[PDB]
């Protein structure tokens, strides 16, 4: 009964929330995000099993507006419904206050959408983790700083230096923890950050990657916009890793 | 004019740790007089008096709504409301009827029990306040009253001297007005006591 709707079990837990988190791994893909000195990057597996599928129509990355990107991990159509609600939110904010929504504010608004379904009966929770990426401005000096914020099915909202989500996330997080001990990720260049993210994917999947197996997104101090990184730029990061 | 249909006027003045507030007694229908015993003052608590002028049906309706909100405030908050919060409440109730107003013009006087500071306010009929440190006036003989007070008021009067000045201002102005008169009532408020007096005037 506690297994079927949002009420508490006797130990204080919510089972539909636990099960919505297994939906995140059931989908079978892995994502990694990392923030370095001047940028934020996100690397997700591009799976095109069927040889007849048109690869440029399958994506886990989307723009919310010009300057904010998302990566969906988990049940794919659930994630597309949250992309549409986030788009609507960012456009209401701009009408009301006359400026584009900051990435920390947007993440909190989507986290509230999720919490409402853990507390009202009759609508299914969405079985996804949404990762949001963007640059944010300081009020002191006016300089811009990259951010990563993740939102989970319970309505939790949090910021990271780097994060792995999906199948074998436990092993990929362990891996990034080790690498962090050498140098904090905010001192690293793009290339060094990228070599750590690609090495973590490979280590956890237990395989070798070509450029066509990963899709990558980026925002930077140089160009605020969220943009897909070209396959040629990724090849050269993988080449650089294969050497060392 | 709807504001002059019913008759009546009100004045309040500030002193050293005291105020005086005064109203006329007439109630009419344009030039006809219905009653000569209708003062327009309402005691809200020991520290606050409200004077209301304007159309008499809206004085009676608006003062009943204010007394109802004040009763619920005391049960929720377990304290008496103070003068600045009371005037903010009244201004908010008038602006709620911005596009179909209550035809009343309130005058509010209060004294902070602790400090001895006096607070006066007058509002227009949609709630805009004005908070001088000397006197406020409203009603049918407002223009004359406003000029009598400017001539007679001075800083730092005690209760008895301040009473004399307010009575003379109210009686001189009412004698030049057809719609206000038949004497006046006054409340004199200090930290320690509240006195009330009936002032004799003309009978026309």
């Amino acid at each position: 009964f506690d297994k079927y709707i949002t009420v508490f079990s006797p130990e204080g837990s919510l089972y539909q929330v636990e099960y919505a988190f297994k939906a995140v791994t059931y989908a079978g893909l892995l994502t990694v995000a990392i923030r370095c000195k001047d940028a934020v990057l996100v690397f997700t597996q591009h799976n095109v099993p069927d040889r007849l599928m048109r690869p440029d129509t399958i994506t886990s990355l989307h723009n919310i507006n010009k300057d904010i990107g998302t990566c969906i991990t988990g049940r794919a159509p659930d994630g597309k419904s949250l992309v549409q609600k986030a788009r609507q939110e960012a456009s209401e904010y701009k009408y009301r206050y006359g400026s584009p929504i900051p990435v920390s504010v947007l993440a909190k608004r989507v986290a509230d959408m999720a919490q409402v379904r853990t507390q009202h009966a009759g609508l299914r929770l969405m079985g996804v983790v949404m990762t949001f990426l963007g640059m944010e401005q300081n009020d002191a000096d006016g300089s811009w700083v990259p951010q990563i914020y993740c939102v989970d099915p319970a309505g939790w909202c949090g910021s990271y230096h780097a994060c792995a989500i999906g199948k074998k996330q436990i092993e990929a997080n362990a891996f990034l923890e080790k690498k962090q001990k050498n140098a904090p990720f905010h001192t690293l260049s793009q290339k060094d950050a990228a070599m750590i993210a690609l090495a973590a994917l490979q280590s956890a999947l237990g395989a070798s990657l070509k450029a066509t197996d990963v899709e990558v997104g980026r925002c930077s101090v140089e160009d605020h916009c969220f943009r897909r990184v070209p396959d040629e730029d990724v090849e050269e990061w993988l080449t650089a890793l294969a050497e060392a | 004019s709807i504001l002059t249909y019913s008759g009546g006027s009100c004045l309040a003045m500030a002193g050293d740790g005291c105020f005086v507030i005064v109203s006329d007694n007439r109630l009419g229908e344009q030039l006809k007089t219905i009653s000569m015993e209708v003062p327009k003052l309402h005691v809200i608590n020991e520290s606050i008096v409200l004077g209301l002028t304007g159309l008499r049906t809206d004085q009676q309706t608006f003062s009943e709504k204010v007394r109802f909100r004040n009763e619920l405030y005391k049960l929720r908050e377990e304290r008496e409301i103070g003068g600045k919060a009371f005037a903010a409440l009244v201004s908010s109730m008038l602006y709620e009827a911005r596009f179909g107003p209550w035809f009343v013009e309130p005058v509010i006087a209060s004294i902070d029990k602790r400090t001895g500071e006096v607070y006066l306010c007058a509002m227009d009929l949609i709630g805009a306040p004005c908070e001088p440190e000397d006197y406020v006036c409203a009603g049918t003989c407002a223009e004359s009253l406003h000029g009598m007070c400017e001539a007679l008021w001075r800083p730092g009067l005690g209760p008895e001297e301040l009473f004399e000045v307010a009575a003379q201002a109210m009686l001189s102005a009412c004698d030049r007005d057809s719609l206000s008169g038949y004497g006046a009532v006054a409340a004199i408020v200090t930290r320690d006591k509240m006195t009330t007096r009936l002032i004799n005037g003309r009978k026309d």
């Binding site: 079927y4 069927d50 159509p77 009759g122 | -």
Partner: protein, 227 residues
């Protein structure tokens, strides 16, 4: 096993069983195939007849949704018809409000969104159809599939329904960069005649449509002589 009574409940493993059951209705239906050439797109489907006394055109599975785009339904036909209506309304909205023919990728994503919303609420059930969408607007020829989960993808060639495993094998021996829309009709029809099972379903016919340069980017049924 109470977890499979409504679409608003996850199972312990992270699945939504009512949506899986709806997919089983599509997998037991008649076969469809489609291919994206350099000119256009071709769709073909098998109709299982329930009587030898039907008029021609009865229970058509292929429907136009704008001048330049069309839909083919697999699985339960009346459910498919509710999606056809929605799609017609989205194509009209795009012309009336934005003054454009709806791009193929946008049409497919709206159809997906609409189907997904019926997998979320205790009072509705999932659709029991998959839709093939074929379009040629200012984004070129495009072929998409949306299923009962609301998942949407783009293809060069595709097969659905009970013959799909074999049909897929035969679509993999085509050359998609080179083929024209007149060759395609011959190959696609052949695949459908070969997977037909003659024991179970005795009476059947084929329905075929296209949108291409030859037709002036108008979506239409092929003339019955080209079969």
């Amino acid at each position: 096993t109470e977890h499979d009574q409504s679409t608003d409940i996850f199972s312990a493993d992270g699945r939504v069983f009512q949506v899986e059951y709806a997919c089983k209705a599509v997998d037991n239906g008649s076969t469809a195939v489609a291919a994206c050439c350099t000119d256009g797109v071709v769709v073909a489907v098998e109709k299982i007849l329930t009587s030898r006394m039907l008029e021609e055109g009865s229970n058509d599975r292929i429907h136009a949704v704008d001048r330049q785009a069309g839909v083919c339904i697999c699985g339960m036909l009346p459910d498919g018809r509710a999606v056809v209506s929605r799609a017609r309304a989205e194509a009209e909205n795009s012309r009336d409000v934005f003054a454009t023919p709806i791009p193929g990728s946008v049409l497919a994503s709206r159809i997906g969104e609409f189907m997904h919303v019926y997998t979320t609420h205790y009072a509705y059930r999932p659709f029991g159809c998959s839709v093939i969408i074929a379009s040629y607007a200012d984004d070129g020829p495009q072929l998409f599939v949306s299923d009962p989960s609301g998942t949407v993808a783009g293809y060069y060639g595709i097969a659905l329904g009970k013959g799909k495993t074999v049909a897929k094998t035969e679509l993999e021996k085509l050359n998609f960069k080179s083929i024209t829309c007149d060759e395609a009709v011959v190959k696609l029809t052949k695949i459908l005649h070969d997977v037909h099972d003659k024991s179970k379903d005795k009476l059947y016919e084929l329905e075929v449509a296209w949108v291409c340069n030859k037709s002036n980017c108008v979506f239409q049924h092929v003339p019955n002589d080209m079969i």
